[PDB]
Structure formats: C-alpha cells, structure tokens
Design a protein around this ligand. Structure first.
Ligand SMILES: [Cu+2]
Ligand SMILES: [Cu+2]
Ligand SMILES: [Cu+2]
Ligand SMILES: [Cu+2]
Lengths: 554, 542
C-alpha cells in the first residue's frame, strides 16, 4: 500500500456522533441537494480519478483490481483473470469488501480535500458531512421519480459544486460519475498498465462509454464513444415484445426478477449467491440479475449483419468483465447488489454458506483485500464471515434498519406493478430455466434470447424483436439463470388456442450473429397459484434452438 | 471596429486555397502521419475564440450571436436577428457570415503561433495556417452506405501537437463537439442572457443534439449530450417502405441535393430561397434543403404523447433559428451551403438576382458586415454583388476549380417522375417551428413522425422561431416522390396516392388547424392529386 505497508480496509472509522450512517439511494440523495456532501463526493472522486497510475489508490488501480490490466495490488501478485470472484458463492462477499474499499478511499480523499481547501469557520461542518456520507446506491429496480432509469447524476456531463470560502459561489465542473477519462488511449498506457481475447476495441478507448463502440465508424470515435444513457434506459426496461402492442400493460422484467429474488423463500446460500451450478424454481439468483444489468448499462454488440438505418446496437465497458469496473456506474451498481444481499440476508437469516456446495468456499481468502486480525495480531486477507454483518464495516441501509417492516418495503418498492398486472390473469405462474457454460464461446460473452412463437431470422435481439420473451447475459461447472414467463405465456396462449409455447432460443455474439454450437438448456415450468401469494413447479415444455437467416449465422 | 471582412489575406505561396471536405481533411491530418498541424491550429484557435469574454465581439458567443439571440449589436451596428431567411439574399448573407468566422479563426491561428511556436518553427506553422480554410460538411455524400455528421464533430476529445515538444501529442476537449459556457445561458450578464419558448434553451450550458426531452430532471438539460447516432438516423430519412425486407433505400437528402444541383432552368429567385412571393417543378431550393438539415442535426420535439419505450424524440440547438449558430456544426453546414451555391452558380452562370422577383433584393446591405470601398475610400456594408465571385474572398472549392468536370463530379458524389410540392406559411403557428410530414396511405394516429412511421414519404421543416409573415409572402419546398408512388401503387391496386399530411409541433402533437398546400405532380409536370390533412388519435392532437 501507500508508504510501503498493507492498506487496511476497515470501512469508514466509527465515530460516536455518527451511528451506522446509511448508504442512500443516489437519486434521492441527489434530489435533496439539487450541498456539501455532493461537493465532497465530486471533488474527492475527481482527485482519485486524476491520481497517477503508480498510486495504488488511484481510480485506475482500484478499478484494475477487478480485471484488466491484471497487475498486482497492495503487494498481492496479479485465460488471464483478475481478483474478482464470478460464478462462485463468494461473489457477494468479495464484492461487499470491494465496494467498501472504494467508499473508504473516497472518505479519506474527502478528509484530505477538507484539510487542503476548507476555511477554519467551516472545517467542523464539512468534516461532519464527510463522516455522515456513505456511498450511494443505484436502485436499478425502482421506478425513477413509470420506468427504470440510470441515476440522474450519471446522465449529467457537468455538476455544480460549492466553492469553500466563497459563500453562494458555485462552479460547474466535469462530473466524475459521468465517465472515467484517461489522458491517452488505454491501450497505450505505461507498462504494465495497458489495456490490451477481448472482442471489443477497449484498447482504443480513452474514456468509458455506454453503447458507444460500433463497427464501421472511424477508430478515433472509439476514444470516447459517449454516454448513450437513453439507450441504456431502454435496455433496462426490457420486457416481452407483446407488451408494446395496443391493449396490453407492460412490466419491466428487471423489476419482476428483483421482486422474485427478494420474496422467494427457501433458497440456500449457494442458490442465491451465484450463477454457479455444479429445482429450477431456485435458479433466480443475485449474480444472474447483476449480469443482465451489466449488459443493459453498457451494451455488448459491436455490429449487426445487413443494412439497418436505426442502429440499436453499440458496446461499452459495463458489459465486459475485464473493463467494467472503470465505468463509475459500476460501483453504484455493486452498492445496490450489496444492498440486495443485505436485504435477502435479513429475510433468510440462517442461509449463510449453509449448503454443501458453498460451505467449501466460505473460508476462501478474498484477495487482495487486507485487514488486521486482532485475535492473531497478523495482517490477513478478508474472509466471508468477516463481512456477514455488513454493519461491521460501519454502514447500513435504510431498508435493513427494521426487519419487521422489510417485507412491506420490498413489496412497495419492487412488487406493485408486477402484482397490478399479474392480478389481471389467472392464478398460475410460469418461469423459464436457463443453464449454460460461461466458457462456451472460449470465454467471450454472449446473450441468450428466448422467444415464444416464430423468430424473425433478421431480428432476434431485444424487446423490439417479434415474439421476444427475455434474455440471459453471459457476463464473461455450469451457470444458471431464470426468467419470469407468466405474462408472455398468457399472450402466446391467447394467439395459439391455449397451447403452451415451445421456448425458442438464439445465442447471439458481439457481431450480432447467431452461434449454432453454444449449448443452452431452456425449459418452461408451471405452477398453480401466483408466486407472490406463495410452489410446485412442473416442466411443461422443452426449449429448442431457433434458426436465423443465413447472413445472420456465425 | 469596424471589423473589415476580407477573407484570409492572399499569400503567393498559397494560391486560392480550397475549403476541404471535413472528413477528407480529418483523415489527411490524422492518417497521412503524425504532423497534424492544421488540425492543431483549428482546434486551438477555436478553443481560444470560444473562451473569449462576452464583451469581445470576436468571441465565439458574439459571432454566433450575430445570427439570432440574444439580439444585440455587433461591430457598432444596432441589433429579429441580422440573419436573412426566406429571402433571396439567404445565400449571400450567409456567404459573408461564414467568411467572417473563417477569417477570425485564421487570425486566432496567427496569435496561437505567436504565443506557442518557437522562432525556428514559425515559418512552418504559418505556412499551414495560410493554407488552411474552413472545411465543409458534405451532408449529402456517403461517409467513408449512409450519410453522416462529420467524424470530428462526433469526437469529444482530439489529440493535438504541442509546438516545440516534437512527438508530444495531447488530448484536449474538442471545440467542434459542442459549445460549452461556464454557466447556464439564461444567466449570462446583461444584455447577453438567452432569455415562454417551448424548448428550455435558457437551462442549457452547452449546445446539444437531441438532448432535451420532457420528463427528465432539468439538470440533465444543462448538457443534454451529442446524440450523433440519432442525428445520423434523421439525416438518412427516406420513405418508410424502404425499410421493408427486399427494398433498397436512397436517402432523400442526397436525392434532393442531386436534383438541386442538376435541374436546369431555375432563376436565382427559385434556387436561392424558400421565399414565394405571390412552377412547382422549380420549388426544390437551397434553403429548404438547409432547413431540413437543421432539424435533422438538432431535433425539435421536446416531448411525445402516449406510452413509448423507444424514445426517438429530443430537441437541440440546430433546429432553432435563435440559437442554432451556437452549435459548432452550424458553420460547417453553412460552409457546404456556400459550396452548393458556388456549384449552382458555376452551372447556372447568368442566373444572379436577375429575375423580376429577386432583382429587388440584389442591392440590400448585408448588415452587419463591413468592408472598405476602394472607390470612395469609405467603410460600407457588404452587398451581394461583392461576393458573387467567392474567390474574391480568397477561398475556393475543389469542385469549382474545374468547371469542365463538374457535371460528372456531381453525379459521382450525389447521383414518369413524381414530385410533391409544398407551400406553407412560416407563421402558420405564429412563428413557432413545425414539421410537415407526408404519407401515402393510412396514417398511424400514434406514429406520424419519421421514417419509422407507417407509410411516411418525406418531411418539410419550418426552420423559424401573434406574429405574421410579410404580407404576400409564403414559403415553398419540394420532395421526390417517384419511388414512394411506385411502392404505393404496387400495394394499392395501382391507385395514385392522395398525399396525406400532418403538421407536427414541438410537443409531438398534430396541429389540426394548419393548412398546407401539398400536391403530387407527374411527368412537363401535371398536377395529379391534391393533399389532404390526416387525423391522428385524440391524445395526439394539439
Ligand atoms: Cu466483479
Ligand atoms: Cu458487476
Ligand atoms: Cu441563418
Ligand atoms: Cu443554417
């Protein structure tokens, strides 16, 4: 660490005037200030982003822990892989520590900012705000203040901040949450830090981008492809195709998935914590939802075959495990994944590494994260049990302050629209199970799209594609996910004399082409009763690969 | 003051330097090799001009201010803007305006060299400044199968040379990407603030393309971004049927530009302007094409009624006369409008303010632009005859260097008939902008906007913004219709379509009360059908 000793991760230190401060919803937090906390977060994160690459607490090196360029960090040596855990049962706990590292570094930068910039009259007030501040979360599953959206702040290129010592003065500055920008293309950073198999030109980017990388544009456009936040919002609101037709109400699949994740009882830790697969009702897991959000924020398709005026594709850092951590929204996404873990823990309190598969991983060192063990007086790595109680890291969430009311809060935040629309149809539920190998395309990402009915051989991509039901993203031993299917099955039955649909799937690569030799096991399952009134699911149809037009075949 | 507009001064090592296609130029600058001196000079000079204070009349803000809001004086001429629209001096007023911008940039390049280039490098850098001319954006040329905004306009940052530190290139914010002020434009010091209008330009710090949408936090409008992919989609507007499987497409903008340049027999009055002062074949004019390009680059619709997951609307500075000049692409669009004028002049050499309609306007003073009169040794305003030969301002275009090959170059670049004629009042909505959309067949009452709307054929944009037009004056445009009539007949038992139109406002609603004269003509063109307004759903009616 800095000054030649391990960097001890503690969370923000405990102050008795500041009992368990909460991580707030970033839109609520911004809206109440649209101002010292906003100023401190902006100015501290700007400093951290501008730190040199040799500084291990620079934004670049902190993001670098996750994936590329796969260097050492804090004395811990660095298919090339990073420190991050994916497709294993420590996925939530490794990321709980990682988010806390980021929050702690930001807090320390806030204190430094105050020491260097704030006059005597205001130091105590500004220090007080730094001590109350916690990293906000992005509630990707909550309607923004009728639709799911990226945070307001992430969509603003500039942000107004206070000028300490100049009352009433504010300055507009580049917003460090909008993008992370380096001084040169990341493929040409000083060794060993160059970002350089990847199937997207991330070596040619200077800044992070959402949907900005498309084939057939000048390579200098890729240096900074922009933040297509409207396109990301569209993706985040994915739902079955039939719901864009007149006379049908829509429900965002991400909100239905999240409501199911939090409300479904009976999962063990191994089922909840990960996509890893060594009863399909239990395949709705945290990591699978997290994987889809990565795709929907960044985009993963660089190209599409054929000629298309409207170009709905485009790729960006958040879809790509090696470089997703560079996008500032990464940390806000993982702050909410940590919040979801804390909520699920609260309503499943005995289910902690409690199954035979996850028990084996409970004691894994969560490298490269150090802490001082007070019992053995040694610097050690974090382990999952150290962070079972997130409050040991001196933060909390409003929703986990009161267990007795958490089930009503879950329903109010995530369940209203699902229940409103589901209530219009009979008392049955349908789900799709999906099982795949994350290595099926040699480690390259891919998207599994499911359809009920005939597939358009030139349009098999998203909610605009005929008969689309939903998607599963391989964000770079098998892997499982689950999709809601209740509403899409109802629509199909109405057009097909009551017949249960055969799920048809297409595996799409980053060129927009269908991969014919990626195995996916898809099935449709039914139970009597609605899921939120809970069941006994039974398989009712087996999946089949769909064919596409010859020009659209990999 | 007065600021004498001359064009870049002549230097015998630089005979009549050309204004290059900005994409070709950008590729030469960055691909030929590392010596990107003209690109560095343009970037650095325009940055300096954009950062000049408001009381400097050669600041970017004040130069853009000549066109429209905030409607102040310039160069001692008291400050409707100075810009000429819907009159026959539209091309010549803008010829002078573009030359002013080019000249100010060149002078700033010379200052940059004085400030930053070492003595032993100054000759090399000055040689590049003296060869540079303002590039044009060829909005009608396929980009190096589709029409596109310039490469450089779509780049947030640009690498430049640092003089005296060889091989050292630095990445800087690109002043062609946007114009960004330090505060919201509605809060600038008197008299310069931009400040009822339907688009929240007072709440913008930066220019935007499609960035302003209703139902987002107002702080998003401070900088709505550059949705250049959405602008490119608009620029490639064509009939809806061409997106069906089996059909090839042809961008309407390229067809319109080809027709503008190759149709013979127009007088200056017909070519130069949308103005119609009381033959439909001759209504394809320079200003109408220019008007649609403004809409396609910027966006004009702030909202849309109803429920839509895919949000294709969004508004931006280039759609709006009062603020369009703030977007740096404005100048590159106008550079190409100047180029199209020069091409048309070359192939129509005796047609210059000499029909009975346009002759009237020939001697208008092109306020606020000054020049020195050698005859009287007095400062005077520019007049159109002063810029009939654009080479007198010491620039040229590659395409007008060899008249003998011009017909073939026009064909290489941009190449029964049916056409649609459109005649409208710019003040049909009191001066507010609107878009006239034309359909062959049934109109979808909730989707009557663009090429994704069923049966869409083409659009006419009113680039304007209770007032009335000049008495006796209206505006005209023309659209190609051959391919669209062929599809319609094929699908509809050979019926010649009745054009159906909708007049759309900035809220995405149909203005039922507006009447436009739309007609279909067929080849020597005969009128074969008259247009009729189409109804839309109740929730989408203004
Ligand atoms: Cu991770
Ligand atoms: Cu993640
Ligand atoms: Cu103008
Ligand atoms: Cu213009």
């Amino acid at each position: 660490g800095p000054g030649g000793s391990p960097y001890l991760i503690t969370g923000i230190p405990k102050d008795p005037k500041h009992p368990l401060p909460i991580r707030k919803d970033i839109d609520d937090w911004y809206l109440e200030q649209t101002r010292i906390q906003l100023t401190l977060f902006v100015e501290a994160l700007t400093v951290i982003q501008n730190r040199p690459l040799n500084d291990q607490l620079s934004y670049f090196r902190l993001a670098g822990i996750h994936g590329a360029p796969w260097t050492e960090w804090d004395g811990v040596p660095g298919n090339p892989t990073g420190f991050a855990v994916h497709n294993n049962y420590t996925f939530p706990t490794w990321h709980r520590v990682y988010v806390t590292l980021y929050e702690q570094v930001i807090y320390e930068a806030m204190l430094d900012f105050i020491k260097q910039n704030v006059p005597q009259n205001g130091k105590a007030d500004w220090e007080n705000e730094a001590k109350q501040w916690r990293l906000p979360y992005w509630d990707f599953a909550r309607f923004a203040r009728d639709e799911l959206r990226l945070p307001i702040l992430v969509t603003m290129p500039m942000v107004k901040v206070l000028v300490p010592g100049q009352p009433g003065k504010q300055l507009s500055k580049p917003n460090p949450l909008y993008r992370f920008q380096m001084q040169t293309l990341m493929g040409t950073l000083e060794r060993p830090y160059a970002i350089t198999s990847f199937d997207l030109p991330f070596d040619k980017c200077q800044s992070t981008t959402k949907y900005g990388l498309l084939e057939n544009y000048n390579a200098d456009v890729w240096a900074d492809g922009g933040q297509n936040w409207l396109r990301a919002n569209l993706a985040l609101n994915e739902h079955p195709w039939y719901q864009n037709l007149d006379g049908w109400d829509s429900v965002p699949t991400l909100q239905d998935m999240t409501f199911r994740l939090l409300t479904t009882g009976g999962l063990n830790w191994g089922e909840f914590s990960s996509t890893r697969y060594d009863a399909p009702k239990n395949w709705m897991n945290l990591e699978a939802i997290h994987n889809n959000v990565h795709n929907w924020v960044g985009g993963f398709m660089f190209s599409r075959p054929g000629r298309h005026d409207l170009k709905l594709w485009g790729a960006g850092h958040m879809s790509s495990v090696p470089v997703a951590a560079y996008d500032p929204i990464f940390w806000l996404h993982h702050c909410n994944i940590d919040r979801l873990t804390a909520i699920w823990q609260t309503v499943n309190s005995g289910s902690w590494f409690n199954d035979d598969k996850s028990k084996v991983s409970k004691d894994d060192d969560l490298r490269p994260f150090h802490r001082f063990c007070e019992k053995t007086r040694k610097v050690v790595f974090f382990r999952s049990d150290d962070v079972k109680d997130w409050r040991s890291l001196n933060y909390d969430y409003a929703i986990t302050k009161d267990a007795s009311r958490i089930r009503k809060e879950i329903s109010d935040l995530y369940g209203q629209r699902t229940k409103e629309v589901y209530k219009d149809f009979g008392e049955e539920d349908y789900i799709l199970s999906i099982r795949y190998s994350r290595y099926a395309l040699g480690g390259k990402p891919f998207q599994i799209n499911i359809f009920f009915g005939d597939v358009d051989g030139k349009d098999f991509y998203d909610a605009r594609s005929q008969n689309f039901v939903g998607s599963v993203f391989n964000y770079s031993v098998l892997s499982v996910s689950q999709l809601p299917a209740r509403l899409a099955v109802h629509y199909y039955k109405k057009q097909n004399k009551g017949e249960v649909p055969t799920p048809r799937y297409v595996v799409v690569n980053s060129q927009g082409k269908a991969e014919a030799e990626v195995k996916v096991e898809v099935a449709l399952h039914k139970t009597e009763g609605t899921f939120y009134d809970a069941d006994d699911y039974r398989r009712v149809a087996d999946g089949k690969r769909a064919e596409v037009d010859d020009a659209y075949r990999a």
